[PDB]
Structures are given as C-alpha cells and as structure tokens.
C-alpha cells in the first residue's frame, strides 16, 4: 500500500498514487502514520519533498500525537528536518507525553539536528509532562552546547513546567 511505498522510498509508485486525486494524501494508517510521517521517519527525502509540494499537511499527528518533524528528528534525518521547518512545521509541537522534536534529537544524540533545531528557535527549557526538559535528555557535551547556543540566541533558560489546556 501507499504506506509501504513511502517507507521504502518507491518514488514512482508514490507519484502515481498521488496522481489519483480520489486518494487522500493526509490519511493515516492503522496507527495514524500518514504517508508523510513514514517518509520522514525513514529518511526518504525525495518522497518528503513530493508530498509537501503536492499539498500534504505538515503538522499531522499519529496516534501518539507525533508529527513528521518528531520522527525526522528522532531518526537523525537532517535534510528532512530542514525541509519541514522551511514549510512551517511547528518546531515545538508536543506529543502525548509532552515531548517536542528536540527531546528526541537530544535523547538519540542527533547532534546536528539538535543544533539546527536550536538555531531555528526550538525552546530548550520546556518540560515534558514528566518534568524533563529536552536538552536534559542529551549527553553532557551536547547538553552544555545547546544551552549556550540557546542563550546566545536570546532564549530564557528558566525551566518551564508543562502546561496545556487540559492539564489543570
């Protein structure tokens, strides 16, 4: 199906599927992963660009409320992260755990993605639902570097406890 073709990066098959406008390019699979989520997760750059340029919604969420930008960051796909940001992805989008894309880039040591996220304004001090800030998921060298870079970019380093509309 379309989801497998996006995971595998079968660009011709994806293009032919998108040509049929009766197909819904935003529709998620059984766990809410859209074509764009899979292409971003698996680093399929050509398919990501095609989906975005043909109109795919950038901030779609899967069953765990991850966006394509969470998945690209978690799996270290630097070019895809930059493409998503260029096309207005919410850089501080939160999933069901209150995690932002920077949490995953930090946790997985995706250093260049984490640095690019902070260069584009990603907040370093926003706790998830369990009180953990993104940069505190990083190993020390990266953790220290990202706080310094954020300070130099005019962020405030005060810890921000989690809040959302339904929290209290």
């Amino acid at each position: 199906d379309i989801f497998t073709q996006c995971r595998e990066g079968n660009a011709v098959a994806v293009r032919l599927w998108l040509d049929n406008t009766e197909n819904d390019l935003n529709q998620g699979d059984d766990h809410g992963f859209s074509p764009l989520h899979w292409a971003c997760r698996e680093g399929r750059s050509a398919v990501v660009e095609m989906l975005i340029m043909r109109g795919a919604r950038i901030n779609v969420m899967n069953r765990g409320d991850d966006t394509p930008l969470h998945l690209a960051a978690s799996h270290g796909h630097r070019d895809i992260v930059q493409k998503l940001l260029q096309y207005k992805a919410d850089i501080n989008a939160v999933n069901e755990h209150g995690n932002v894309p920077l949490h995953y880039a930090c946790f997985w040591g995706q250093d260049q993605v984490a640095e690019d996220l902070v260069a584009n304004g990603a907040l370093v001090s926003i706790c998830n639902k369990y009180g953990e800030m993104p940069v505190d998921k990083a190993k020390a060298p990266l953790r220290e570097l990202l706080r310094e870079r954020a300070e130099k970019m005019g962020q405030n380093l005060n810890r921000i406890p989690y809040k959302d509309t339904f929290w209290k």
């Binding site: 766990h31 069953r63 765990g64 069901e96 755990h97 998830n128 369990y130 953990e132 190993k139």
Partner: protein
C-alpha cells in the same frame, strides 16, 4: 533485568547510548546488555518500564503503553 554497581572493564559501553560507566555507578543489565539507568527506559516516553517489561520495534525498546499506541 538487574541493577549492578559497576566495577568492570574500561571497554564496557551502554547498549543504548554507547557511553562508558564510572566505578560504583548503578547500572542495569538486561539480557547481558549494560545500560545507564537513564538509558534503560522507553524510547518514546523516556520513563522506566513498568515491572521491567519492554517491547522491541526496529531496534528500539518501548513500554507496553507506547508499543500498543504506535506499533502493535
């Protein structure tokens, strides 16, 4: 899995993050793989596995809740 207090080889590395251990450090041994306490956690929520139970998907480990939400 079991908690250990490290006094092993200088070559020893965490299965998740590939960093080394300090003498006396509380670590986890799961099936012969060694982890920092902060690394033997679910890849999605970063929290400890309830009762030590995890589920693998493509080389990462998940708690039951996140595994069922995303991959089951």
């Amino acid at each position: 899995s079991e908690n250990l207090y490290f006094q092993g080889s200088a070559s020893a590395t965490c299965e998740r993050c590939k960093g080394g251990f300090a003498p006396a450090e509380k670590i986890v041994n799961s099936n012969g793989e060694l982890y920092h306490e902060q690394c033997f956690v679910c890849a999605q929520c970063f929290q400890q596995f309830p009762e030590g139970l995890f589920y693998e998907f493509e080389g990462r480990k998940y708690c039951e809740h996140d595994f069922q939400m995303l991959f089951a």
